[PDB]
Amino acid sequence: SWEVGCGAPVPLVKCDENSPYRTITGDCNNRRSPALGAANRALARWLPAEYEDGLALPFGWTQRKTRNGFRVPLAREVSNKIVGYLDEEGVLDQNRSLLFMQWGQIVDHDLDFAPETELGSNEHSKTQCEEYCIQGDNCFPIMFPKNDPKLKTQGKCMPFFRAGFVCPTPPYQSLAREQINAVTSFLDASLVYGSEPSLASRLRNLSSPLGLMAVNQEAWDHGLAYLPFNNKKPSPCEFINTTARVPCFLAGDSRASEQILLATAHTLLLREHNRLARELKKLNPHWNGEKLYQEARKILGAFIQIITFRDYLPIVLGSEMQKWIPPYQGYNNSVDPRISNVFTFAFRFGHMEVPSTVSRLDENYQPWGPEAELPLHTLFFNTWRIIKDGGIDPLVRGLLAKKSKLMNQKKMVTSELRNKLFQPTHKIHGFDLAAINLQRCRDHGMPGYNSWRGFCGLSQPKTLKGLQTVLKNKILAKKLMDLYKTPDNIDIWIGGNAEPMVERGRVGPLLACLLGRQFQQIRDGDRFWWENPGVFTEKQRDSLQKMSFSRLICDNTHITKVPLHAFQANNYPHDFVDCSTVDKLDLSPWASREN
């Protein structure tokens, strides 16, 4: 009997079996198991969770508890010795735009979010973790290795709180601890609309029956809309410049303001919505707010899906694309659509594609102002640079005309993220995304590198020399062996990202397999997948397949020169062309005459 009949949530809902629209929660997608791929349920386990005590405590928690007979190395030490680098010269991806990085993050945010356990409010224990670096309960601090410069300027640790888990909040116990996915597993634009009822209605333009999203009432971008602002005081976007006092945005997803390009992308998405909704009203004046909201939402859902599957995944997965994600063959209700706990680490390959600077560029795609280029760390939680420093258009052109960082075995994660990350409530630009990722693999009970190699039908190196051969890199294998002792102990995030990239792709074979399999399932196990006979008409679909990111820019900003292929590295003006040469979204097939 599954000791299923956990957990006390999620406020179970009931389905309208002939509803033509998705729920907000993702309930009801799968008819026979309606909670599948819904938000606020456990991330799926492709392999059993691996905890120090079998149930909940992470490897590394108890100093004298080994993993396979070896101590697991400090996350920050792995980070310092392997992940970091000094010289940003030469690190850029010659064939991927910055938008490639950015769309990766957007997709990730559509799919998964394992928020921290919520116990630190109404209490200092959260501030005591930071202050005293005392491991316990949900405080699992990232301690500095001796020799860390941060030890000299920053104290003993970086604070880190364990992720939320189902059943959920109070600690224990019986089966293994299962982390929660706070968003819908479907690729459904949940980051624009929200994955909870509360949030989803708050976001909409209810006053007006046009079914627009709520827009900003204090700022505009050459008349084009901005996201609404967020109420929650204290605001990290306020905190990073108290003079400017500009708060974070309010999106479907709580992380929308984390970095300025994410907030930028979110802005394009909310606008396409209204562009569609109003366009729909024009062509169907009879439809109330709802019908327009849902029809706009649904097209946008399709937009995310299409760009992701037609434009993005092929240039991540490369040669392995075919093998894991073959041409669509319809909805299959036996396929598990849930995001796996491992995927949420495999998709953090993006972290190695983030470059050290962001640019604002002008209509000639030239530096915009005298500080056109800024270090990435000054743009974390930064809304004021958008509203008071030229709106989104200069940033969007940066997205097209600048390049992603290329992953590099000797230059993995820029120090902007590896030393200068900001976390709300923690005041400093002093955190380490890489170390966090490693501690979080352990927090989540991740099987090690070789377990996952084995899952994917790949060899499992057991010696330094075997690891050299798999990684095609002597020195990197030697560093990982020195720290981890056995490849069986290499944390998945670093193991997966250390593999050389597959031909025509940007991740290695292990991640290709973890990624590919997840993406296959989110497409095949989705009853509302755009191409699934019945979701859209044949004519809508010849039209949906017209859509493009170049197009979404052209229709939602004052940029009129775009590339046809927005994810490749494009230089102005040679690889740019005017907006009128880029196919439009022909909405004719949405015309409804109910005469």
Ligand code: HEM
């Ligand atoms: C400036 C760029 C970025 C910043 C500042 C950023 C920051 C972060 C932070 C703070 C977390 C939470 C880490 C934790 O506590 O475990 C995170 C998680 C994550 N990052 Fe990023 N990241 C960026 C880019 C990207 C990109 C480009 C991708 C993918 C292509 C990505 C994928 C993810 C995923 C999947 C998670 C886990 C989400 C979840 O299930 O909770 N990130 N990132």
Ligand SMILES: *[C@@H]1O[C@H](CO)[C@@H](O[C@@H]2O[C@H](CO)[C@@H](O)[C@H](O)[C@H]2NC(C)=O)[C@H](O)[C@H]1NC(C)=O
């Ligand atoms: C805080 O934001 C303020 C407000 O925009 C920034 O100051 C602006 O920057 C330059 C020179 O200081 C001027 O062109 C603006 O008009 C300034 N405005 C004001 C009111 O001073 C300031 O640089 C930001 N500070 C940080 C640390 O990010």
Ligand SMILES: *[C@@H]1O[C@H](CO)[C@@H](O)[C@H](O)[C@H]1NC(C)=O
């Ligand atoms: C809702 O729509 C009306 C009419 O277009 C507009 O004036 C109003 O500002 C909108 N409200 C918000 C918060 O978006």
Ligand SMILES: *[C@@H]1O[C@H](CO)[C@@H](O)[C@H](O)[C@H]1NC(C)=O
């Ligand atoms: C649905 O997926 C399951 C498990 O992967 C498989 O057994 C089944 O054949 C698939 N259905 C169709 C119609 O292909």
Ligand SMILES: *[C@@H]1O[C@H](CO)[C@@H](O)[C@H](O)[C@H]1NC(C)=O
């Ligand atoms: C750049 O990548 C695209 C796919 O993004 C590919 O078709 C093209 O051949 C590549 N360009 C170069 C110059 O290698």
Ligand SMILES: [Ca+2]
């Ligand atoms: Ca989603």
